Write a protein that binds this ligand. Structure first.
Ligand code: HEM
Ligand code: HEM
Lengths: 145, 145
């Protein structure tokens, strides 16, 4: 269950998430757009899913892309704030899962975000340990897909 | 025009938003759910739009309502964090406007949240001055619908 995946995140994983989020979450516009543009660069097959945003190659200049990317960073803020209450984490993960289920995004496709997260973290010198912690949070969402 | 509406957020208004958000934003779960249950109690005719959340009369005990409500408070957080930059505020407002346009929510119906906001504010000892500041931020969204 989602709860199981949630309930599993340990004190050390939560620490590494919070520590790296302090940095990555401090520039939501810049890091959110880098996350999205990295997804599109590395996984070109996903571009079609984002047709509402218009020409995503425009980066920061594309207002729809910038609004989406900032907002995505607040979904991660939300998850980070809920880490200590699995019950609250589960209900917000289930809400965002629905946003993706309705777009036909599978658990495997959702996991394509791990590559972009690892690259953004690495840009701030957070290494593999940090990328592994983030994959475990992503895995909570995958449990709902 | 969203841009004209955004221009109405003067220095004084911004300060009153930030000062009151310091208090209401500190309990996203509790204040989020209070806002929604106040909406539903005072404006019963809007309940039908929220079919996906199930039995909203259950309040905090309804997991879907709790997840939705927490998330709504992060939309507000997002707006407050964008007050420094009007181009960023506008692009996040337009993102959320689309979420409501697709649900067939008009500017007038969206404005039904002003009553609930005033009540939640008043419950924390923030009076009309603060409710009016909040109505100016809601008006930015209304301009986009
Ligand atoms: C860290 C991981 C992710 C988070 C936190 C996240 C969060 C979000 C949020 C907050 C939205 C807006 C939902 C709405 O307003 O309806 C969204 C939309 C969307 N997401 Fe994600 N997402 C993630 C990863 C992905 C991945 C990996 C894909 C596809 C492979 C994906 C596909 C979509 C699509 C197609 C939309 C709708 C875009 C639009 O038309 O507005 N997401 N996501
Ligand atoms: C301060 C004002 C409000 C804010 C910040 C806000 C924010 C949000 C957000 C962030 C969502 C989730 C969007 C998604 O995942 O698709 C949402 C959904 C929704 N909102 Fe609002 N909202 C506000 C007021 C209203 C009002 C007054 C109404 C109706 C009169 C309304 C109707 C809806 C509906 C029907 C949904 C979809 C619920 C569901 O099926 O998940 N909103 N809103």
């Amino acid at each position: 269950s989602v709860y199981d995946a949630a309930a599993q995140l340990t004190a050390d994983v939560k620490k590494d998430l919070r520590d790296s989020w302090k940095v990555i979450g401090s520039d939501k516009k810049g890091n959110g757009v880098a996350l999205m543009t990295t997804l599109f660069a590395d996984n070109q097959e996903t571009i079609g899913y984002f047709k509402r945003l218009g020409n995503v190659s425009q980066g920061m200049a594309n207002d729809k892309l910038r609004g989406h990317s900032i907002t995505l960073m607040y979904a991660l803020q939300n998850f980070i704030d809920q880490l200590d209450n699995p019950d609250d984490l589960v209900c917000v993960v289930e809400k965002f899962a629905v946003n993706h289920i309705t777009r036909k995004i599978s658990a495997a496709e959702f996991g394509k975000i791990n590559g972009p997260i690892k690259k953004v973290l690495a840009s701030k010198n957070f290494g593999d340990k940090y990328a592994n912690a983030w994959a475990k949070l992503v895995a909570v969402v995958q449990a709902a897909l």
